Amino acid sequence: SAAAEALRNSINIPPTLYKNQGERVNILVARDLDFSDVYSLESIPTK
């Protein structure tokens, strides 16, 4: 059958996702992030 042939040859077309710009997302931190080499803390003298 021609119709069954066309379906068999074009039925598996994976979908496409569209996400607009400017939308809010998260990042779930997967590992411990160590910031000990690039910052240090100091007290600000009063006045």
Partner: peptide, 28 residues
């Protein structure tokens, strides 16, 4: 038939100045 939706277009009714006061980074 169906296409990807567009992001929200802002209205054009409530147009007003951004700068109510002069920014301090202008040193003013």
């Amino acid at each position: 038939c169906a296409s990807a939706p567009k992001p929200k277009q802002p209205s054009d009714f409530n147009r007003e100045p951004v700068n109510k006061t002069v920014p301090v980074e202008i040193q003013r």
